[PDB]
Amino acid sequence: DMYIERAGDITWEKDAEVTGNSPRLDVALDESGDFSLVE
Amino acid sequence: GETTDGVYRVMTRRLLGSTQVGVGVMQEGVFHTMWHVTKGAALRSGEGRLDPYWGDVKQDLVSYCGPWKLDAAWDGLSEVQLLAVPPGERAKNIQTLPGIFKTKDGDIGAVALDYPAGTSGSPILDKCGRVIGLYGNGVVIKNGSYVSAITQGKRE
Ligand SMILES: Cc1cccc(C(=O)Nc2cc(N)ccc2C)c1
Numbered sequence: 419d420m421y422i423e424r425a426g427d428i429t430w431e432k433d434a435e436v437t438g439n440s441p442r443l444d445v446a447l448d449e450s451g452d453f454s455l456v457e
Numbered sequence: 458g459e460t461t462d463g464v465y466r467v468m469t470r471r472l473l474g475s476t477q478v479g480v481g482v483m484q485e486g487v488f489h490t491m492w493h494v495t496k497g498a499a500l501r502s503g504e505g506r507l508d509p510y511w512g513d514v515k516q517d518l519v520s521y522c523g524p525w526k527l528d529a530a531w532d533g534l535s536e537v538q539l540l541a542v543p544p545g546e547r548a549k550n551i552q553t554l555p556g557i558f559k560t561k562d563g564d565i566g567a568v569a570l571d572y573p574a575g576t577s578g579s580p581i582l583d584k585c586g587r588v589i590g591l592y593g594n595g596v597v598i599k600n601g602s603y604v605s606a607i608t609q610g611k612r613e
Contacts, residue, residue: 420478421501422465426540426548428482430586434538438553438569441604445558445596451492451517453558453596453606 458505566607
């Protein structure tokens with residue numbers, strides 16, 4: 419049995435830790451909802 | 458039970474201790490999460506029961522108590538914030554510029570941030586704090602790191 423616990427408000431925070439790159443990826447979505455890498 | 462707008466942990470007792478299986482967004486009385494998190498099962502909110510209303514394994518989304526409410530989209534230009542809610546750690550906003558999923562059916566925003574699976578369903582926000590999609594369904598790249606689709610539903 420699953421339950422839910424509140425964890426915060428939905429708000430954009432000025433001065434948030436800015437990170438992660440921006441890759442352009444060729445992908446295929448299957449009927450099971452799993453993405454995969456085409457090349 | 459608890460219906461306030463906001464971000465929520467999804468927990469189970471069916472494994473060792475209490476384990477965070479994922480995350481979701483309460484908006485307008487509807488709970489939104491990713492299908493793989495709950496697998497369509499009901500949820501508890503105090504005494505409150507939350508029964509599924511809509512879902513699609515392929516979009517990998519599910520809504521509880523109503524229909525999908527979240528209709529904002531990535532503009533394709535500006536940076537966004539993953540409001541990441543990792544297992545046993547505090548809600549932390551991470552700002553990033555999406556990259557792109559190129560598919561035969563069209564192009565999706567993608568966020569290149571590495572977190573445990575139990576962060577699935579964390580919301581992605583625009584500069585106005587609107588939810589433009591959910592994190593935790595995507596691909597494992599050359600490195601071993603995860604890239605997630607910005608997975609948004611359709612509002613009726
Ligand atoms: C490392 C990492 C980070 C975030 C999510 C996942 C993941 O595996 N997602 C997922 C997708 C589908 N389609 C089904 C089931 C799960 C659990 C993995």
